[PDB]
Amino acid sequence: MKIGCHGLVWTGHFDAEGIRYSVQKTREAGFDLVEFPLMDPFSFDVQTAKSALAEHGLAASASLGLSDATDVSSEDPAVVKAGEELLNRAVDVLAELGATDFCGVIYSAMKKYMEPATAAGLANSKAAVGRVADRASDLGINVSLEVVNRYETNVLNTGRQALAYLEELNRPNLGIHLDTYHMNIEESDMFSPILDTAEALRYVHIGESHRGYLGTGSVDFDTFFKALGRIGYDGPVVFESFSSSVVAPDLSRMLGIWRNLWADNEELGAHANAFIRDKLTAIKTIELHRS
Amino acid sequence: MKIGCHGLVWTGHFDAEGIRYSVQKTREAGFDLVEFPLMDPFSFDVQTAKSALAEHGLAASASLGLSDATDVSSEDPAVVKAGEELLNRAVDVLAELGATDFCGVIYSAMKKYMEPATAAGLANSKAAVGRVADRASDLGINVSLEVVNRYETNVLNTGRQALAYLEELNRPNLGIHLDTYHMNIEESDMFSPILDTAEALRYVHIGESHRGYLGTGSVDFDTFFKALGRIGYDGPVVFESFSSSVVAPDLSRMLGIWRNLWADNEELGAHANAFIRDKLTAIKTIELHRSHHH
Amino acid sequence: MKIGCHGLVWTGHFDAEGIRYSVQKTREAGFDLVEFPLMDPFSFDVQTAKSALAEHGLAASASLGLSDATDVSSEDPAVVKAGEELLNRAVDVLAELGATDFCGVIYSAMKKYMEPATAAGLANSKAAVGRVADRASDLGINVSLEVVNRYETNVLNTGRQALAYLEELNRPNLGIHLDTYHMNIEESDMFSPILDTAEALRYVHIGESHRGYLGTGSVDFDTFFKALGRIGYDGPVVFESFSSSVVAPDLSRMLGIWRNLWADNEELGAHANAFIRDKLTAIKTIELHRSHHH
Amino acid sequence: MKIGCHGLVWTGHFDAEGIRYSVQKTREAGFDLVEFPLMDPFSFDVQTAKSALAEHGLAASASLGLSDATDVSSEDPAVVKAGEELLNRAVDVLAELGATDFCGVIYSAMKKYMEPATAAGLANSKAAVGRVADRASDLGINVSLEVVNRYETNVLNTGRQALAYLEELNRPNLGIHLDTYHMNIEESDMFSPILDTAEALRYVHIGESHRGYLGTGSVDFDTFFKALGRIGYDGPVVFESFSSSVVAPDLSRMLGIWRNLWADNEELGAHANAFIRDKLTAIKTIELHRS
Ligand SMILES: [Mn+2]
Ligand SMILES: [Mn+2]
Ligand SMILES: [Mn+2]
Ligand SMILES: [Mn+2]
């Protein structure tokens, strides 16, 4: 299990300096892994990232969400294609890094839709994701679909919806990515979705209800972590948080980050690392007593 | 305290038939009050509502959310005017019903903004809401601003933000409307925002985390209702729920209701009435036990 | 699934009058079943209970806790015998009623021990419970061992302990009885012990953290009932509550009921029935939505 | 605010070696303060404790519970007197240490009673506690009554009961001591009792529902700490935990510690210190934003 940190804790700009900075800070906060927000994989400086990861002994993953121009759930084949092209480059970037996990909202745009999904849109999305998965698979990379709330997709809002989507595709390297922030809205509770997704669960984001400091909102982390313990989950567990104090040119607007929920990210990151690790220690003692 | 039900439990279409239907089913489910969604107050058949309510004994309130063309937080004063004219008609509708509560997202568009609020936009919102509140005042109508999550406004996402907004306007009939579904996202916990708003809290929505059946999501209703008890809240407590089974032409899309969270609204309504009353009974025993006779 | 009420809601004295009273009030409060506390099965007026139950339609079960003189976890075989004779009569009473569930703290004294269990004491408990279960078996009676907190036993404080106990005895009619009040103390959470016990779980008590009104304490009923849904539990679900207002000569003292948590048992019973059914309704909608037709 | 640790994490025997050991281990786990279980204040080696506290820069408090022989809620004046004598020595021990907080179940025996309290018993308890408080007061020591569950007293099971008890006594240095483990049973919720006891709240124990590792039971710490933040609580916050792995000759039997809930107390103590401190950090950010 890798304990990770999403890059937007540190910076919204991942040129060379931001890549080095984000990696250093992640390591200094005590994490094993940085998740790069790869909103534009075409301009991501792989050589710098590979160097910085080596210098600091850090593992890496990457996430993104698509947009209007790249929506693979569009009925417009050209838009679908732009999306597929973007996902393929993201996968290629991860291959060059020697990383193994790609994730995010890659089955639709990451946006507040104003109508429900279409049958033809959903078919396009599934076909495109299948092909991306296969390309990833030949490269040793796992692809995990992030279940997000109603205001960020109209396609996969629950773990059970994601399972059905995966069932159709039947790809060995396609998994599910759950995020406590999104679960806290859409799911019946914080254990059922973990039990249900069991072995398909390949990636986890730890976010508070308002995406600030862990333990300052309404997310039931105790139930969540106890359920992760029960299924023996051993994939990445990655802190994600957003404040108006650190802005990405698109992502922050897309996720509606209006509030200053923190200004000291060194404190935030260290706290989150301690929060997650100490939760996991607690869970380990429970599992130890089941002997 | 009135126990209320929002109209989208019953129908998405508030023509004459839908209005009578929502009133009847609301009463039959055990509620004291129906909340009409007044997305277009200009077309709402007030006389049918009056006669339905009189038939059934039932109290009414109304809520709406604004949209792009009617956004009173717009920098464009023509858009603000359009919004203000809409809010003013909503208020008039309520006056004609003899109702006393208007609420909702009436200080901005109810939408996912793509940039944060501007100073000019915020000043326009505040001035317009002030004028609407004054108008409401002389018609005996209380106006409460509903705090909602980051995806439905960029203006008032927390109770404390609403407090600061209210303090500047300083109007006696202006209050805060909290909704457990939105609190579940943006707030630090389910008690602090109640203790903070205290006497400014004038309206409450009871919604599960996914806006389905009460008790089937992750909202901490326990803490919430206990806090309501502590401040002695006596305002409306109104069930709200949305499913793809029952669709309003604009509201449902605006709120991102993609999923089929229920198909039996008779069952859903009856259950919500019971669920809310069973909580209220509980906290009544707690307050009783704080009595010095105990 | 029967929704049940424990007798100490209604009276502390189960003479003829108290028996009829508890049956009537239990039914009138909306329950399917009454649980008689059978602390002294030898004096219990079985024919009055039979005739009361027949009058009212109502199902019955029984529970007890043992005491020092009847402690089947004692190293002293004369004490174990006294206990076994008591349990055997409890079972006979239930047989005579045509009831099918016996439960409670029947594997030890229900008491605050001052030292941990011994090997000899544990072996005596197990052997006695085995014989009692076999006896029960041929009378069509299921026996479930209630897991309780450290202050009421030193033997079975967790579901997993009860599982290990059950595994050794390997009897088809022997099950586990969980009580949310006790789980709230000793267990890691409110779902794991349900998922672990699964098919061995045969009886459930619904009790608030302080054993008062449901929803007025800190028990996480949400998680609990959702777990019950997941394993498809269909056994008895029985409300239990104690107040100094209604006192049983020994039980109340044994359980440390010092406080006046309610005075109106009509209200309390009606509320508990509603509270439990409103939870069960909720989780039924969840299970319905896991159906492939959905 | 002092972050503290109860001595039974480390040892059940507080001779000189156990005193030094408990203090060292507490400091090494990262705490500010050790709480000595002063079940027998007459044989407590003050000189050793004072030395060990100085060597490690640690503050100290003391708690105890009374027993049958020393029950100040007895109707037997001789038993009441033995109890008062014991409490006075405990207070004297704290004075010699230069410590300022005495707490625990000092208004009755710490036991499962088999009958309710008596009017005459309660009067004896209140009078005795009043006198002990006055003696403490002349010595600069605060006295805090620990609210405990129905199986450990028949006198003070809720914060509100404790407030009423204090109301009668009207002593300036008499406060209330709340313990999450006991609240988790008896109280309506985890915030009301803090709001209600407000300025009378002078001491806090942090214990999980089963008194093992923090975060492995049912206690709602999030609500609890958020309420402590709201009232601006600045007294001791002290971890308490019990396992059959570490036994005190009386206390462990009195508290019904039948289970092995941990065996590595160095891990337990460090975890608890991190758990509490990181909770408090989270709360501070909430309070900071109320600006
Ligand atoms: Mn995420
Ligand atoms: Mn609402
Ligand atoms: Mn029970
Ligand atoms: Mn304590």
Q: What's the CA gap between B185 and D220, in Å, rounded?
A: 19
Residues 6+ apart with CB under 8 A from C103: C61, C62, C63, C143, C144, C145, C146, C177, C202, C203
Burial call C199-226: b when 16+ CB within 10 Å, e when fewer: ebbbbbbbbbbbbbbbbbbbbbbbbbbb
Q: What's the CA gap between D74 and D69, in Å, rounded?
A: 9
Which residue type sits at D291?
Answer: S
Rounded to a whole number of angstroms, the distance between the first and last alpha carbons of chain D is: 21
Distance of CA D144 to the CA centre of its chain: 8
Residue of C nearest to A222 (CA): C189
Which residues from B are below 8 Å from A257, CB to CB?
Answer: 150
Do the beta carbons of residue B273 and residue B239 sit within 8 Å? yes
Q: What's the CA gap between C113 and D252, in Å, rounded?
A: 11
Residue in A84, A187, A208, A240 annotated catalytic: A240
Q: Which of B3, B34, B42 is nearest to B18 (CA)?
A: B34
Do the beta carbons of residue C257 and residue C249 sit within 8 Å? no
Q: Which of A234, A232, A220, A222 is nearest to A282 (CA)?
A: A222
Q: What's the CA gap between D3 and D31, in Å, rounded?
A: 6
C177 CA distance to ligand 3 middle (Å): 8
User: The domain spanning residue B271 has which CATH number?
Assistant: 3.20.20.150
Residues 6+ apart with CB under 8 A from C276: C3, C206, C214, C237, C239
Ion ligand 1 neighbours, Cβ < 5 Å: A 179, 205
Q: What's the CA gap between B124 and B97, in Å, rounded?
A: 29
Q: Return the H-helix or E-strand segment holding B229.
A: helix B221-230
Cβ pairs bridging A and D (under 8 Å): 42
Q: What's the CA gap between B230 and C188, in Å, rounded?
A: 30
Q: What's the CA gap between B64 and B47, in Å, rounded?
A: 19
- Does B230 sit within 8 Å of D189, measured CB to CB? no
For the record, the structure tokens of B111 come out as 């939408």
Which residues from B are below 8 Å from A244, CB to CB?
Answer: 116
Query: Annotation-wise, does D182 bind a ligand?
Result: yes
DSSP B118: P
Which residue type sits at C175?
Answer: G
Distance of CA B201 to the CA centre of its chain: 12
Rounded to a whole number of angstroms, the distance between the first and last alpha carbons of chain A is: 21
- Does B222 sit within 8 Å of D195, measured CB to CB? no
Distances (CA, A) of D243 to A144, C158, C251, D37, D261: 42, 15, 29, 15, 5
CA torsion, ordered C208, C212, C214, C217, to nearest 10 deg: -60
Q: What's the CA gap between C256 and C244, in Å, rounded?
A: 10
- Does A222 sit within 8 Å of C192, measured CB to CB? no
* A90 class by beta-carbon count within 10 Å (0-12 exposed, 13-18 middle, 19+ buried): buried
Helix C16-29 vs helix C265-289: crossing angle, to nearest 10: 50
Cβ pairs bridging C and D (under 8 Å): 87
DSSP C150: T
**How are beta strands D142-146 and C142-146 bridged, if at all?**
unpaired
Domain that holds residue D72: 1-291
Q: Coil, helix or strand for D206? A: strand
Do the beta carbons of residue A27 and residue A57 sit within 8 Å? yes
Residues of C acting as catalytic residues: 146, 240
Phi, psi of C79 (to 5 degrees): -65, -45
Which residues from C are below 8 Å from A160, CB to CB?
Answer: 290
Which residue type sits at B56?
Answer: H
Q: What's the CA gap between D269 and D259, in Å, rounded?
A: 18
Closest approach of C189 to chain D, Cα-based (Å): 6
Residues 6+ apart with CB under 8 A from C6: C34, C35, C37, C63, C205, C238, C239, C240, C241
Distances (CA, A) of A219 to A189, B190, D283: 10, 11, 15
Q: Coil, helix or strand for B190? A: coil
**How are beta strands C101-109 and D237-239 bridged, if at all?**
unpaired
Q: Which residues of C lie inside 8 Å of B (Cβ-Cβ)?
A: 212-216, 222, 260, 262, 267, 271, 274-275, 277-279, 281-283, 285-286, 294
Distances (CA, A) of B285 to B30, B231, C214, C221: 21, 15, 10, 19
**Cross-chain CB nearest to B188 (options A115, A149, A216):** A216
- Does B188 sit within 8 Å of D191, measured CB to CB? no
- Does D267 sit within 8 Å of A213, measured CB to CB? no
Distance of CA D249 to the CA centre of its chain: 18
Which residue type sits at C17?
Answer: E
Q: Which of D214, D134, D148, D138 is nearest to D176 (CA)?
A: D148
Length of chain C: 294
Q: What's the CA gap between D175 and B52, in Å, rounded?
A: 59
> What is the DSSP secondary-structure string of A28-84?
HHT-SEEEEE-S-GGG--HHHHHHHHHHHT-EEEEEEEE-GGG-TTSS-HHHHHHHH
Q: What's the CA gap between C26 and C60, in Å, rounded?
A: 10
- How many other CB atoms sit within 10 Å of the CB of residue D89? 15
Long-range contacts of residues C122-127, Cβ cutoff 8 Å, at least 24 apart:
C122/C73, C122/C155, C124/C72, C124/C73, C124/C74, C124/C75, C124/C77, C124/C80, C125/C72, C125/C73, C125/C80, C125/C155, C126/C165, C126/C168, C126/C169
Q: What's the CA gap between A32 and A26, in Å, rounded?
A: 8
- Does C222 sit within 8 Å of B282, measured CB to CB? no
Helix C221-230 vs helix C265-289: crossing angle, to nearest 10: 50
Give the max Cα distance, chain C.
60
Give the max Cα distance, chain D.
56
Q: What's the CA gap between B203 and B142, in Å, rounded?
A: 10
DSSP D147: P
Q: What's the CA gap between C239 and D114, in Å, rounded?
A: 24
**Cross-chain CB nearest to C218 (options D190, D253, D258):** D190
Residues 6+ apart with CB under 8 A from D3: D30, D31, D32, D33, D236, D237, D238, D273, D276, D277, D280
* 3-state per-residue secondary structure call for C51-106: HHHHHHCCEEEEEEEECHHHCCCCCCHHHHHHHHHHHHHHHHHHHHHCCCEEEEEE
B266 CA distance to ligand 2 middle (Å): 20
DSSP E strands in D8-156: the ranges are 33-37, 59-66, 101-109, 142-146
Q: What's the CA gap between D115 and D133, in Å, rounded?
A: 27
Phi, psi of D188 (to 5 degrees): -70, -30
DSSP D172: T
Q: Return the H-helix or E-strand segment holding B81.
A: helix B77-97
Name residue, tokens 């018609």.
B139
Q: What's the CA gap between C26 and C23, in Å, rounded?
A: 5
For the record, the structure tokens of B123 come out as 């000043």
Q: Coil, helix or strand for D228? A: helix
Q: What's the CA gap between B208 and B218, in Å, rounded?
A: 7
Distance of CA C112 to the CA centre of its chain: 18
Distance of CA A124 to the CA centre of its chain: 22
A204 CA distance to ligand 1 middle (Å): 8
Which residue type sits at D78?
Answer: A
Between CA C6 and CA D232, with CA D192 as vertex, the angle to 5 degrees is: 155
Q: What's the CA gap between B52 and D20, in Å, rounded?
A: 80
Name residue, tokens 């990636």.
A203
Distances (CA, A) of B281 to B278, B286, C246: 5, 9, 21
Residues 6+ apart with CB under 8 A from B166: B145, B174, B175, B176, B200
Name residue, tokens 């047989």.
C95
Distances (CA, A) of B153 to B14, B160, B206, C77: 25, 15, 19, 73
Rounded to a whole number of angstroms, the distance between the first and last alpha carbons of chain B is: 24
Q: Which of D99, D117, D113 is nearest to D63 (CA)?
A: D99
Q: Which of B78, B101, B37 is nearest to B241 (CA)?
A: B37
Radius of gyration of chain C (CA): 18
Distances (CA, A) of B105 to A253, B176, C78: 21, 11, 75
Which residues from B are below 8 Å from C215, CB to CB?
Answer: 222, 278-279, 282-283
Residue of A nearest to D271 (CA): A278
Do the beta carbons of residue B211 and residue B260 sit within 8 Å? no
Do the beta carbons of residue B149 and residue B107 sit within 8 Å? no
DSSP E strands in C73-199: the ranges are 101-109, 142-146, 174-179
Say how many CA atoms lie within 13 Å of D30 toward its Cβ.
Answer: 14
For the record, the structure tokens of C231 come out as 């394993």
CA torsion, ordered A200, A205, A211, A215, to nearest 10 deg: 100
Name residue, tokens 């679960």.
A183
Length of chain A: 291
Distance of CA D114 to the CA centre of its chain: 24
Which residues from C are below 8 Å from A189, CB to CB?
Answer: 222-223, 226
* Total number of domains constituting chain B: 1
Q: What's the CA gap between A37 and A69, in Å, rounded?
A: 18
Name residue, tokens 């805060």.
B176
Q: Which of B48, B123, B38, B47 is nearest to B86 (CA)?
A: B38
Q: Which of B225, B155, B148, B219 is nearest to B184 (CA)?
A: B219
Any catalytic annotation for residue A146? yes
Q: Return the H-helix or E-strand segment holding B64.
A: strand B59-66
Residues 6+ apart with CB under 8 A from A97: A46, A49, A50, A53, A60
Do the beta carbons of residue C229 and residue C262 sit within 8 Å? no
Rounded to a whole number of angstroms, the distance between the first and last alpha carbons of chain C is: 24
**How are beta strands C3-6 and B237-239 bridged, if at all?**
unpaired
Q: Coil, helix or strand for D173? A: coil
Q: What's the CA gap between D158 and D114, in Å, rounded?
A: 19
Burial call A215-236: b when 16+ CB within 10 Å, e when fewer: bbbbbbbbbbbbbbbbeebebb
Phi, psi of B205 (to 5 degrees): -100, 135
Do the beta carbons of residue B96 and residue B49 sit within 8 Å? no
B243 CA distance to ligand 2 middle (Å): 14
Long-range contacts of residues B124-127, Cβ cutoff 8 Å, at least 24 apart:
B124/B72, B124/B73, B124/B74, B124/B75, B124/B77, B124/B80, B125/B72, B125/B73, B125/B80, B125/B155, B126/B165, B126/B168, B126/B169
Q: What's the CA gap between A240 and A26, in Å, rounded?
A: 12
Distances (CA, A) of C294 to A126, B55, B260, C175, C286: 21, 37, 9, 34, 11
Q: What's the CA gap between A214 and A273, in Å, rounded?
A: 10
Distances (CA, A) of B64 to B143, C166, D97: 12, 59, 66
Q: Return the H-helix or E-strand segment holding C166.
A: helix C159-169
Q: Return the H-helix or E-strand segment holding D197.
A: helix D192-197
- How many other CB atoms sit within 10 Å of the CB of residue A93? 21
Do the beta carbons of residue B138 and residue B163 sit within 8 Å? no
* A136 class by beta-carbon count within 10 Å (0-12 exposed, 13-18 middle, 19+ buried): buried
Phi, psi of A42 (to 5 degrees): -75, -25
